[PDB]
Design a protein around this nucleic acid. Structure first.
Length: 63
DNA sequence: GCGTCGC
DNA sequence: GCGAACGC
Protein backbone atom coordinates (compact mmCIF):
# COMPACT_ATOMS: atom_id res chain seq x y z
CA UNK A 1 0.00 0.00 0.00
CA UNK A 2 1.02 3.66 -0.25
CA UNK A 3 0.69 6.84 1.80
CA UNK A 4 -0.07 10.07 -0.04
CA UNK A 5 0.77 13.43 1.51
CA UNK A 6 2.02 16.90 0.75
CA UNK A 7 5.28 18.09 2.21
CA UNK A 8 6.86 21.50 1.72
CA UNK A 9 4.74 22.22 -1.36
CA UNK A 10 5.48 18.85 -2.98
CA UNK A 11 3.20 15.85 -3.50
CA UNK A 12 4.60 12.61 -2.07
CA UNK A 13 3.40 9.01 -2.33
CA UNK A 14 5.39 6.53 -0.28
CA UNK A 15 5.06 2.74 -0.17
CA UNK A 16 4.12 1.73 3.36
CA UNK A 17 7.00 -0.80 3.40
CA UNK A 18 9.35 2.17 3.50
CA UNK A 19 7.81 3.78 6.61
CA UNK A 20 10.47 3.77 9.27
CA UNK A 21 8.91 5.28 12.40
CA UNK A 22 5.35 6.51 13.07
CA UNK A 23 3.88 8.47 15.99
CA UNK A 24 0.72 10.41 16.88
CA UNK A 25 0.57 14.19 17.52
CA UNK A 26 -3.09 14.78 18.36
CA UNK A 27 -5.02 14.09 15.16
CA UNK A 28 -1.81 14.13 13.11
CA UNK A 29 -0.09 10.88 12.19
CA UNK A 30 3.60 11.78 11.81
CA UNK A 31 6.29 9.51 10.34
CA UNK A 32 9.76 9.05 8.83
CA UNK A 33 10.53 6.88 5.80
CA UNK A 34 13.50 5.53 3.85
CA UNK A 35 14.52 7.42 0.76
CA UNK A 36 17.27 7.05 -1.77
CA UNK A 37 20.87 7.86 -0.90
CA UNK A 38 20.59 6.33 2.55
CA UNK A 39 18.44 9.27 3.63
CA UNK A 40 15.34 9.57 5.81
CA UNK A 41 12.29 11.60 4.73
CA UNK A 42 9.52 13.01 7.00
CA UNK A 43 5.78 13.03 6.42
CA UNK A 44 2.44 13.55 8.17
CA UNK A 45 -1.21 12.93 7.38
CA UNK A 46 -4.52 13.43 9.03
CA UNK A 47 -5.75 10.40 11.08
CA UNK A 48 -8.95 10.73 9.04
CA UNK A 49 -6.82 10.11 5.92
CA UNK A 50 -4.56 7.47 7.50
CA UNK A 51 -4.36 4.04 5.81
CA UNK A 52 -5.07 1.26 8.34
CA UNK A 53 -1.66 -0.29 7.55
CA UNK A 54 0.03 2.91 8.85
CA UNK A 55 -2.27 3.21 11.84
CA UNK A 56 -1.57 -0.46 12.76
CA UNK A 57 2.13 0.29 12.77
CA UNK A 58 1.46 2.90 15.44
CA UNK A 59 -0.25 0.42 17.76
CA UNK A 60 2.28 -2.26 16.82
CA UNK A 61 5.29 0.03 17.25
CA UNK A 62 4.83 3.16 19.40
CA UNK A 63 8.65 3.19 19.53
C1' DG B 1 2.61 23.28 21.70
C1' DC B 2 1.59 18.66 20.83
C1' DG B 3 6.05 14.33 19.08
C1' DT B 4 9.87 13.80 16.54
C1' DC B 5 16.06 16.56 9.77
C1' DG B 6 19.54 19.43 8.58
C1' DC B 7 22.10 22.53 9.64
C1' DG C 1 20.60 24.08 20.06
C1' DC C 2 17.09 25.33 17.07
C1' DG C 3 14.07 26.64 12.71
C1' DA C 4 10.96 24.40 10.04
C1' DA C 5 7.99 20.84 9.08
C1' DC C 6 3.47 18.27 9.70
C1' DG C 7 -2.60 18.48 11.16
C1' DC C 8 -4.80 20.60 14.58
Amino acid sequence: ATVKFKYKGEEKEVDISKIKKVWRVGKMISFTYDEGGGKTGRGAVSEKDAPKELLQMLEKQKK
